[PDB]
Design a protein around this ligand. Structure first.
Ligand SMILES: Nc1nc2c(ncn2[C@@H]2O[C@H](COP(=O)(O)OP(=O)(O)O)[C@@H](O)[C@H]2O)c(=O)[nH]1
Ligand SMILES: [Mg+2]
Ligand SMILES: [Zn+2]
Lengths: 38, 201
């Protein structure tokens, strides 16, 4: 078997291109490094 | 692609950078974070249930316990604490590093790593390791410069994070060739010493 989408990304979530932290839709800048979400 | 942020903490000179650099692809595809002074190494491990990626956060400076910024710890899902088995003071500060992790990240799986076991003049021996009750704190001997037990912290963390005890790495990642030999006789004795001590606690 696979991981069965255990760690699926929620629709609004975005992965920061700079530091790879997963951010919530409401975040416009990354919560760890403050890089803007595109 | 499941991925986890892993923070790699411990006193300076313990071998954190040497350790994470062993994973060759994670070094070639590492990311620098200018605002935080941090390098994120994306380490891929291939399990029997698929690829897992540990995004390992390595400091660029020799900051003490409580010296790292808040953004370093943000969204950390696991951790490795490192000390040098030839320096007791680095092991004395393991509890300090552990407090900082609980304070800012609450309950995450943590592995404890005594590095540089290739050195014969080992000060911190298995009999001297203070083992603890919590199941979020496992100890492993490692030698970064020899790749000795390199995959064990990650395999344990993978098992706790995924919630599967029988999770296997079907293959070892491409690691940098050893720069020192891990004497197999020392290794055989250390493995046995560790086994007897973990049976006690
Ligand atoms: N014999 C031995 N030396 C190591 C090992 N790991 C690191 N060293 C050395 O310990 C020194 C500090 O290494 P470094 O990665 O910068 O530690 P850091 O400050 O935690 O990043 C360096 O001289 C390393 O070459 C090891 O596993 N075995
Ligand atoms: Mg370093
Ligand atoms: Zn970021």
């Amino acid at each position: 078997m696979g991981f069965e989408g255990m760690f699926t990304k929620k629709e609004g979530q975005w992965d920061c291109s700079v530091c790879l932290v997963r951010n919530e839709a409401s975040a416009t800048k990354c919560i760890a490094c403050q890089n803007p979400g595109k | 692609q499941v991925q986890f942020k892993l923070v790699l903490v411990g006193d300076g000179g313990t071998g954190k950078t040497t350790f994470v650099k062993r994973h060759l692809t994670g070094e070639s595809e590492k990311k620098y974070v200018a605002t935080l002074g941090v390098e994120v190494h994306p380490l891929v491990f291939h399990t029997n249930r698929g690829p897992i990626k540990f995004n390992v956060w390595d400091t660029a400076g020799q900051e003490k316990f409580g010296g790292l910024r808040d953004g370093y710890y943000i969204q950390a899902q696991c951790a490795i604490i490192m000390f040098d088995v030839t320096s007791r003071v680095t092991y004395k500060n393991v509890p300090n590093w552990h407090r900082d992790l609980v304070r800012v990240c609450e309950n995450i799986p943590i592995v404890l790593c005594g590095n540089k076991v290739d050195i014969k003049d080992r000060k911190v021996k298995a009999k001297s390791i203070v083992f603890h009750r919590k199941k979020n704190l496992q100890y492993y001997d490692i030698s970064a410069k020899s790749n000795y037990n390199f995959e064990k912290p990650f395999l344990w963390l993978a098992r706790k994070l995924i919630g599967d005890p029988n999770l296997e790495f079907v293959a070892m990642p491409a690691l940098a060739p050893p720069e020192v030999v891990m004497d197999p006789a020392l290794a055989a004795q250390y493995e046995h010493d560790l086994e007897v001590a973990q049976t006690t606690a």
